[PDB]
Structure 1
Amino acid sequence: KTASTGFAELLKDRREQVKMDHAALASLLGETPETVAAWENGEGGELTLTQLGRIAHVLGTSIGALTPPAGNDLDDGVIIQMPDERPILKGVRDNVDYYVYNCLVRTKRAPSLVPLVVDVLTDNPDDAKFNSGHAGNEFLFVLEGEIHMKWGDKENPKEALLPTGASMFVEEHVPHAFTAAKGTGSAKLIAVNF
Structure 2
Amino acid sequence: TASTGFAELLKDRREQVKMDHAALASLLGETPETVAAWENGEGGELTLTQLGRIAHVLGTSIGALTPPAGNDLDDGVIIQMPDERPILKGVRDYYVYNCLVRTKRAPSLVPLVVDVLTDNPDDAKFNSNEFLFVLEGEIHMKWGDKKEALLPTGASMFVEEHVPHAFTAAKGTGSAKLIAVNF
* Both structures adopt the same fold (TM-score exceeding 0.5): yes
* Distance in 1 separating the partners of 2:63 and 2:7: 13
Deviation at 1:59, TM superposition (A): 0.8
Q: TM-score, normalised by structure 2?
A: 0.97
**Can you give the 5+ residue segments of structure 2 that lack an aligned partner in the other structure?**
none
Q: CA deviation at 1:60?
A: 1.2
TM-score, normalised by the number of residues in structure 1: 0.92
Please identify, of 23-32 and 2-11, the stretch whose mean Cα deviation from structure 2 is larger. 23-32
Write out per-residue CA displacement over residues 43-97 of structure 1, whole angstroms, 9 at most, x where no aligned residue. Answer: 100111111111111111111111110001001111111111111000001xxx1
Provide the secondary structure at the position in 2 that maps to 1:106.
coil
Please give the per-residue CA displacement for 1:82-137, whole angstroms capped at 9, x wherever unaligned.
Answer: 111111000001xxx100011111110000001000000011112211123xxxx1
Q: Structure 1 stretch 48-57 or stretch 20-29: which is displaced more?
A: 20-29
3-state SS, counterpart of residue 84 of structure 1: coil
For 1:152 and 1:26, locate their aligned partners in 2 and report how far apart those are by CA, in whole Å: 53
Runs of 5+ consecutive residues of structure 1 not aligned to the other structure: none
Identity of aligned residues (%): 100
Give the number of equivalent residue pairs: 183
CA distance in 2 between partners of 1:55 and 1:153 (Å): 44
CA RMSD of aligned residues (A): 0.9
Q: Give, in angstroms, the shift of residue 153 of structure 1.
A: 2.2
1:56 match: secondary structure: helix
Rounded to whole Å, the distance in 2 between the matches of 1:173 and 1:23 is 47
Name the CA distance, whole Å, in 2 between partners of 1:108 and 1:17.
28
